[PDB]
Structures are given as C-alpha cells and as structure tokens.
Design a protein around this ligand. Structure first.
Ligand SMILES: [Mg+2]
Ligand SMILES: [Mg+2]
Ligand SMILES: [Mg+2]
Ligand SMILES: [Mg+2]
Ligand SMILES: [Mg+2]
Ligand SMILES: [Mg+2]
Ligand SMILES: [Zn+2]
Lengths: 229, 119, 56, 115, 122
RNA sequence: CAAGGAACUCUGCAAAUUAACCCCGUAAGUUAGCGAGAAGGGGUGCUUAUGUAAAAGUAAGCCGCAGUGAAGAACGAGGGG
RNA sequence: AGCGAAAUUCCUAGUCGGGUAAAUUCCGUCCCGCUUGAAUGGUGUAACCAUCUCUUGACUGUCUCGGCUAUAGACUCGGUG
RNA sequence: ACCUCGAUGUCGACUCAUCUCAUCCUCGAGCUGAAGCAGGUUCGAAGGGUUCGGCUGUUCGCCGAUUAAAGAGAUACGUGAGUUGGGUUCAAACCGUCGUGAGACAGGUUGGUCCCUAUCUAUUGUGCCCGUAGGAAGAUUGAAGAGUGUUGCUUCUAGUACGAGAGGACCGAAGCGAGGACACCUCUUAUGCUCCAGUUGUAGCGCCAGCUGCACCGCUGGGUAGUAACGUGUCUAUUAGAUAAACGCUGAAAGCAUCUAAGUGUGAAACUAUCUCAAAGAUUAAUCUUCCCAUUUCGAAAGUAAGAGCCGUCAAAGACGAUGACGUUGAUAGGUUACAGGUGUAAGCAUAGUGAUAUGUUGAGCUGAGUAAUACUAAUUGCUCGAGGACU
C-alpha cells in the first residue's frame, strides 16, 4: 500500500498516564522535518519509491559530489539520504512533518539500527543453556552444545550451513511492529511512541505505517491532572 | 594457570596515580607511559583547581592524595603548592597540564609521554 | 590437535603474506633539521615552537 | 541541529502534578486511591510509613508499608498519577534515604517523631 | 513468584498450617503462579481437628506473594509471605473465614466469594 | 544475586549455615565411664557511676540497620549394615 | 539353637505395614533358607568411625534461570622462543 | 566373518539438535450400529510443539499430577580432541555358590587416574587485496537466500439447533493467558573495585579531631552511568495464487449413467507469495544520480585540483583490524562551570550535658562513567596514493 514514513532520532524513554488509568511507557523521538529529494516513479524506473533527506548540516561539512547534487537539485544540504518503498503522494522539495502523515493514536511500526554488543558467546546470542556447575562438570561449560551431526562417512561428515554459534551480535537493523503513536508536539519537533524503541539513544530511527494493520487506529487520550492545593 | 600476580587492582591503580601526581607537584614533569599520564591528568587537574582557596578543608582534601617525595615531604609539598603553584593558576579555567608524546622505548616499544604543567 | 599432513612451503608463505610491515608517518621538525615521527617530539627538544625537554 | 535531553523534561512538563507535598523517606502518609469498577468511584485509604522517595520527575516513586491482622504489606506508587492524592499526618526522624531495615521488625519498632 | 514445590502459608480456617506446591496449572511448563493463578497443592502439615488430613491433594488459589507483581495503573503491590485459600473445584473456599488481606486481581478471575469473606482487600 | 529452597543429581558432591568468651538449659540409651560443646536459647558497642587487689560483675545513659561490628574459630536430628 | 528376600534370594521390583502426591532404594514383619547356621564362629550390644545406606530441620546459585563486577590469562604491540 | 587388534574409546545422563512419516495434537476429508456431546476406523498432511517429579546406573518400566499432545524411529543404538563416570571393564575386600588348591561366577556388595596449545576441511563472524574497461561519492532494484509460523481458557452468539432427559453444539465474534522470539531500561529488581554514609582492629600523618595504608572492595546500608531479567512493549497474524485428500457443474466416450477425456470450479498450519533480515565476488560483476579530470614529445612521464590513506582525539562501535564522529574554518576527548541523579545534615564553630552524645549553622557536604555549555589542554605551521576512459 501507499506507505507513509518519516525519519528521526531517539532522545530517551519515559512514561505518561492516560485515560483508563494505566501507566504507558513512552519513547521520545526528536523528528526534525525531512525533505524529499527524489521521486522514483513506477514508469521511470520500474518501481515506486520516494527518497528522503534528513539530518540537516552545514554546507562545509559535506562531500563535494553530494553538495553539488544538492545545489543542482535546489534543496538544503543534509548528511543522510534514504528512500522508502511505496511512498507516492509527495512531490520534489516539499517539506514534510510527522503531523502531516499520522493521527494522534494510530498504528505504526519502527525500524532502527540496534545496539551493538561486540563478539558475544553462543548462549547469550541464541539463548542456549549452560552445563551443570556442580559435581565437577569440567571447565569448558559455557558452550553451544554438540555441533555433531553424523560421525562416519555415510551420515554427515561436516557441520551444517547456518549453524548457531558465537559471533558478532547486535548493531543490525531490527523492527518492532504495532507501536501506537501517543502524542505530537509541533513546537519542539517531537513525537511520542508507545513501547520500547530499538537502538541506542542519539541514533537514527525510522517510522513507517504498520504493514500488519495499515490504517487501524485505537485512540488514547491523556489524564490531565486535577490536583491542586 | 591458577596462582597469579596480584595485578593492577584498583588500589594499585589509585596509588600509582597518587605517586605520579605527587611527583608532578614536586618537580613539574614526568616521563611515564602515555596511557597512565592520560589518567593521572584528571586527578592532577582536580587537585590543582581545588587548591585555589587555601581553607583548611581544601588542605584536608588534598591530604587524601599526596605522598611525600625526596625533594619535598608531604607538609612542605602542601606549603609549596598552596603558596606558589595555585597562585600561578588563578585565572586559567581548567587545563593546567599538557601531555605530549615521546618516542617508543627500546625495551617494550611502549609510548612514553611527558605529563607537564605550565601556563 | 595436530597437523595430519606437512604444511608445505607454499601455504606458509601464503599465510605470511600479510605479516609484512608498514612505515610510520614522518615529518620534519621546525627550528631544527631532523625526521621525527609525526605527532611526537623530536630529539631536538622541540614539539613545534615550544620547550618540553633538555637538549637531548 | 543539536539537542538538550531536556526535551524529556519538557514533555513530562504537561502531566506533572501541581502541589506534590514534600515528604522524606521517614514519613507516614495516607494515599487516597480511586477505584472504578463500573461507576461511583470508591475512595480507598491506604495509610502507612514511607520507605523511599526515588525518582527523577514523572518517574518519582515511593514505598508505603502497612500492617493488617499482623500481615505486613507494602505498595509502591507513582506520585504524578491521577486517582492518587497524598497528604502528611506525622513527620518522623531518620538518617537513611531508603530504610530497608523496616522489613524485618515486628511491633514496637516505630520511627521517632521529628519536631 | 511461587513455583513448583513451594511450601507456603495458608490463609483460611481449614487447618492447613503448612502446605507445599505440587504443580502449577493452566498450561505446559507454567513454572510460575502470580496473583490469582489457580494451583494444585498437597497439605504437609495440619491441625489435629481439621477438615483436611495430611497427605491429601487439593487445588488452591494464591492470594499473597512475597515477590509481588506490577499492576496496570503503575502501583506495585507486594506482601511479605506466600499464602493461599483452599477452593473446592468451582469458586468456593473449603473454609469459612479468611485471615489477612487478599489481592484485588482475584476480582476479575472470579472468586467473588473470597472477596466477600476477605477481611480487607488491597 | 530478587522469588522459591534439593525441584539438581548416581548421591545435599560442591557450596551454603553455626562458630570466641560468659550465662540458662540438656533427652533416649549404657558396659553407669559416657551420651554431651547433646538438643534449644540469651548477652557482648561506647560513656558515667559502682565495682575489688586487677578485672569480671551491677546500675544509669547514648548511638547505629547491625555492637567476638573486620580477621580466627563445631551445622544438627532420627533409623539401619 | 539362633537369625532370616540379609554385603547371601535366581522367580524377586515377593506379600503386608510404616515413610512420600507418587518410593526397583529404606525401616518392621511374614519364611518352600535353590544354597543361612554355629570358633573359616552364631545372635545382640553402650561409645567410636575423613566407612556404607535411608528420612528430616536450618541452610544455601546444586537447581527453575541465568545475570553482573574485578583480577590473571585469552587478544593487540615490543623481546626470547 | 568382509573392513579396523603397528587401538575405530563401548551404557546411561547433560548440551545442541537434524532428518523420515508408518501422525500425538493442532489442520482438511470420507464412512459409521455418527440424534447432539463424545467417539471408532480410514484417507491427506512433517509447518510448529510434544511436561514436571518418586524409585532404579539405568535405558525400559510402574506410579503421581498435569497439558491440545506427553508420537513412532534414524543419525558409529547422533553427540568424551563438548561434560560426567552412577554401570560395565584393572589391581583391594567381603557374602552365597563351585573347585581339595591356586582361583572362578551376565550372582551381589564398598572403594577406584577419563590426556591434547586446532595443520586441512566444514561452520560462526570480522577483515586485507584484487576484480567488475576511466577514477570517486552516494542512492537503489533483487537473481539466488535465510528467519518466524505453537496453542489454550472464559464470555457472547445460545441453554438456541439436536434430544423426551440428563445433556448439549457447527459456523463466528470478543477478552485474558502459557510457551517461544525480537527489542528496551521510564517502572520492579540483580550487579554496579577511583560514589555516598556508618563502623572494628592495627601503623602512621610529632598529639586531639580529621584522613591515609591493610585486613574478601575489611565489613555493613544504599547507589550514578552501564550491562541484564524476575521487569515492560511487540510478535506468534491476516490475505492472495496454485494444489493433496475430498466435494462438484456440464458432458460424452458406452442414446442411460458418469467429477474428466475437452471445458469449468470449491478445496488444508503443507507449497509459492504477503511478514522480518541479509544480499550485485549475481565474474551473468545490474540500474540511477552527482563530482573529478582531456596537458608534458619522442609505448612512456609529469600522475588531481574528485577522493582516499598514514598520524592524532574518541565512541552510539569495538578482540586487532573495521564501522561512525571530529582534526583549529574545532565541541572529538580531557579539564572548568552550571545542572541532573545518588548519598544523606560534611568539617569547623557555638550551646547543653561530667560523658558517650544531642541541637543550631545545614536538605549541608561529597560525587566514576550521567545532561549541557566553555578552546584552558590535547586533535601541528605534515607525508603518500590517486586524472587524460583502451577497441567495436
Ligand atoms: Mg581433570
Ligand atoms: Mg593417516
Ligand atoms: Mg601472521
Ligand atoms: Mg566375626
Ligand atoms: Mg593406526
Ligand atoms: Mg574430555
Ligand atoms: Zn628537531
């Protein structure tokens, strides 16, 4: 479908209190207005996509071909450029803000680069188990179990492709789906998203229309205080 | 291997920092490994900036770090500091010491550096 | 765990192909003529235009 | 551009309560609670002593400990929460910001009043 | 977080002073019974003039937990002991009186007889 | 290391509890010697006063979550070969 | 005589009772004891055992269920090898 | 008795599983001595799941409580250069039995050494070089792929259909869960060795006070940032195509009949997609955009002015490489300042008390990483690689 998307950063995580009197955890996303830079039309190049440019920066802090592209296209220089598949209803050079794309409490999903953790063990990676600690189970007892598949020339004589062992973990794009929007703040270029947002604070976060539930909305109001003394 | 050296425990680390900052106060320059000067500099700067008041409480706090040296014992080192070193730095906001790099040693190729302080 | 066949003189060279060295950045110190390695002090006693040491 | 991480504080600035009476770890309070089953929201009092005052804003929390029929119960709360009101009845003297040592004493263990 | 084989106090007048867990119910490998979840137990210590003798197997509903559990509205209730009540296969306790406070999350699951007989619900 | 406390396992293996001094209190059994430090509990900090030869001891008061505040100190019960 | 599914019992994981929610292990009892049995001793026996075996209190990362921290390695750089 | 006796380490248990279908559940369907509920048998189906305990070395089994289910097998009866050693299978000893005797018993009982630093390949990752017909910086398409797919309970539909009567639905809707997975640290906890406070002994700082060294971080109560779960969010759908079993419409072959031969359908957690991730070394080296270059004269040799590397300050990254940010035209690190958070009323002084000590100064003092400002210090007034697109 005609996917809606927008880019921002992650500045922390907090909570807010809503009607029905439940504590809702909140991630706060500083979403500076993006700027379309290319409209990939179905006719021109065999698919429909739109390219966003965000994280505006000074002209000097930019490579020469990139700055030349920006000057020739008559846009504002930005550090990052990315495109979203199946985004149609926008034209070149039009500024976009998250309030122009979303309701106050409808359904969106979020994809962002995860938090790196370096080379890690198998158990901490694949959620394996740990050999016994009593009765003297020997020293190599934090390992991925037996990788044996078959002993003898007939059976396997190898270790199968796509095994589960230790390796680099994290710092990879991940996606959490069906995270409700909670509120906007046009004054500070700010949006509110329920749930937990992947990635370390200060990174780059992407927001898209949820694929599982495109237009579904279950609105949530606030719980403005009534305590005075 | 089961038995081993005590190694670089937190107490050893902080005591080395104490010794090096005391030596810097005594003389004004040290030829030590770069990745030790880069740590000593923090306590050096904190002690220098703390000693710009000369109240008894600040001298008590300084007592927690200094160690006597061949040139100056601890009390004489305190008098030296609070009488001539701190007055020299009464208007420089932070950054009282510099850490420049030497060439590697022939023994270990470690990168010696000079922890030095001046205006 | 021991080698079953002799590792030949070809595999050893292939492995040691990456064991080569590289030169460190070199610069000419000012106020005095020598080739110190960059971002360090020369034996001349000058780091740029500043006093950090004795003569040598 | 650049940020402040006070954007957080700015976004809690909407739902932060007004009065938020000042109480330390060693106080006893009464927290009125609103319960809505269907209608006619009943107010349930829950009086006891405070065990902690942790938090940094809307995440401010406290612990209130109570005893009924000899069974000691404690309930954590969020200050800046509707359906919750707080007042002071007695102010007590104590030297610790998180008095965990009140979990393992029976009666005749009461924090002394603070003039 | 009362788990498999968890001796725990009893909070009614059935005379079942000390009872241990024998299985947590509701699914395979439940391994945890929070407030409200029905468990089966086995009385391991009673009073001489009790309606339940030692060694019987019975189902019970937990009321008080030491670990506690986060509530939806933000509060986090937590008791200091593990208790239960001895139900009889639909909703009703095998006893007549209930000792100590009882959690509120038993309201939705049913068990309204317990809340009626409860001295003070929290 | 929260909750649980042998569910681990071939077995409470290993690890965990108690631990010094002083004071109450100690069963079955027995070859009447033992059992037995059985079991199970209480106190120790500081100050003043009173202590006597010194000190234990005693009274009053004070502080901390905690008072052989660390370091060194027995975990038991029951039955059988 | 005594003792007796025993360090001995193949059928046998014998019957029954006790212990547990559940007990091829344990305790008591029964006796067709293949082939128990009296100085290669038979039956009991208080104390003792870095002896074997079962139940239990306290106790605990043994375990449900893994997590964190510090060192010395591991890894990177120089030297020997 | 065919390979191995100039050694192929053999039971069970733990860890990790993978595969087959002769299917345990979930899924579809036919028949019935199938009223309904519940069943029995058979056909299709391997996507996913298939419990925890007592006894035994145990597989196996019996039992107890469960769940939708507690499948049948294979992989040197999977798996010791992954663990264990309870058993078998060393010397010791004892019981019964046999042997006149040394001794023996798939008869039993107690104790009893389990080595290896990874060369090749396979796999997990992460790099250097070169290549893709000029060089470089970005943005993409996606051939070939990988990952996930479990299910229950309650309420309503409805005590309706069915049934005499107990009983009691198909189809669907909603809510709440268990397990597993992916993230996150606002909440709850765990940990949190240059944090705060209390406190013992000892040796010092010439003594009081106050600090330091050591005693498991000496011990104890908390605790920043960070890392996590026991914590909180999401997922575990939905939809489309083509099909298995099966049911068909029409229709002859064979004037009837007939699901099939033509034609035309309905049709399952299986298959191809929808979902997530990676991906042009996809040499079949794809596409797009932007920037840089056309000289020095007999194939060279100047070889950029696009860019990149060496070196430096670092971390959202991290074993080392790399990745990402920044190198004076600078907020990258440190320092300084302000603040947050944590700890909890500092020292000194005054008052009261004979004294431990109490009150006032004081929500004070202190602070590893946290938030933010500020060139004070450190990232130098450096070296190297790198262009004329070759032919159709
Ligand atoms: Mg060994
Ligand atoms: Mg060979
Ligand atoms: Mg090499
Ligand atoms: Mg004898
Ligand atoms: Mg051989
Ligand atoms: Mg081994
Ligand atoms: Zn020079």
């Amino acid at each position: 479908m005609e996917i809606r998307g927008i880019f921002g950063v992650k500045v922390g995580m907090s909570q807010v209190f809503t009607t029905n009197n439940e504590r809702l955890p909140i991630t706060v996303i500083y979403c500076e207005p993006n700027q379309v830079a290319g409209v990939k039309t179905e006719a021109k190049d065999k698919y429909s996509a739109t390219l966003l440019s965000f994280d505006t920066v000074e002209n000097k802090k930019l490579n020469k071909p990139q700055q030349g592209f920006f000057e020739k296209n008559n846009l504002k220089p930005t550090k990052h450029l990315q495109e979203i598949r199946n985004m149609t209803g926008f034209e070149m050079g039009q500024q976009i803000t998250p309030q122009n794309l979303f309701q106050v409490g409808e359904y969106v999903d979020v994809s962002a680069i995860s938090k790196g953790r370096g080379f890690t063990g198998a158990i901490k990676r694949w959620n394996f188990k740990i050999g016994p600690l009593g009765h003297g189970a020997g020293y190599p007892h934090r390992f991925q179990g037996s990788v044996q598949a078959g002993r003898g020339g007939a059976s396997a004589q190898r270790v199968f492709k796509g095994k589960k062992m230790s390796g680099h973990y994290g710092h990879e794009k991940v996606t959490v789906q069906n995270l409700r929007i909670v509120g906007f703040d046009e004054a500070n270029m700010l949006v509110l998203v329920s749930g937990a947002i992947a990635g370390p604070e200060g990174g780059v976060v992407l927001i898209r229309t949820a694929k599982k539930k495109p237009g579904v909305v279950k609105p949530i109001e606030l719980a403005v205080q009534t305590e005075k003394a | 291997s089961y038995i081993n050296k005590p190694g670089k425990t937190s107490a050893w680390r902080v005591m080395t920092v104490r010794q090096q900052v005391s030596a810097v106060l005594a003389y004004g320059k040290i030829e030590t490994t770069l990745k030790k000067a880069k740590n000593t500099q923090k306590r050096l700067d904190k002690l220098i900036t703390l000693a710009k008041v000369d109240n008894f409480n600040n001298r008590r706090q300084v007592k927690k770090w200094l160690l006597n040296t061949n040139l100056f014992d601890v009390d004489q080192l305190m008098d030296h500091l609070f009488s001539k070193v701190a007055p020299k730095y009464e208007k420089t906001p932070g950054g009282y010491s510099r850490v420049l790099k030497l060439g590697p040693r022939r023994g270990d190729a470690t990168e010696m550096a000079i922890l030095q302080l001046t205006d | 765990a021991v080698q079953q066949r002799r590792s030949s003189k070809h595999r050893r060279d292939k492995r040691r192909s990456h064991d080569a060295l590289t030169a460190q950045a070199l610069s000419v110190c000012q106020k005095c003529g020598k080739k110190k390695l960059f971002h360090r002090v020369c034996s001349c006693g000058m780091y740029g235009d500043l006093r950090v040491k004795k003569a040598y | 551009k650049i940020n402040k991480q006070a954007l957080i504080d700015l976004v809690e600035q909407k739902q932060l309560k007004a009065y938020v009476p000042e109480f330390s770890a060693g106080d006893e309070v009464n927290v009125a609670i609103k319960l809505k089953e269907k209608e006619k929201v009943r107010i349930q009092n829950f009086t006891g002593t405070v065990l902690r005052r942790r938090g940094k804003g809307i995440s401010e929390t406290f612990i209130v400990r109570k005893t009924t029929d000899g069974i000691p119960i404690e309930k954590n709360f969020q200050i800046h929460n509707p359906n919750i009101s707080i007042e002071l009845k007695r102010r007590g003297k104590v030297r610790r910001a998180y008095i965990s040592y009140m979990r393992e004493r029976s009666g005749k263990a009461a924090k002394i009043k603070e003039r | 977080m009362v788990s498999f084989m968890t001796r725990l106090n009893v909070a009614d007048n059935t005379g079942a002073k000390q009872v241990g867990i024998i299985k947590v119910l509701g699914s395979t490998r439940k391994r945890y019974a929070f407030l409200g979840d029905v468990v089966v137990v086995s009385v391991k210590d009673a009073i001489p003039s009790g309606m339940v003798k030692k060694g019987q197997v019975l189902r019970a509903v937990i009321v008080r937990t030491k670990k506690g559990q986060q509530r939806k509205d933000g509060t986090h209730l937590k008791f200091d002991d593990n208790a239960c009540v001895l139900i009889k296969e639909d909703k009703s306790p095998r006893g007549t009186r209930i000792f100590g406070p009882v959690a509120r999350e038993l309201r939705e699951r049913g068990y309204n007889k317990i809340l009626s007989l409860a001295v003070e619900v929290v």
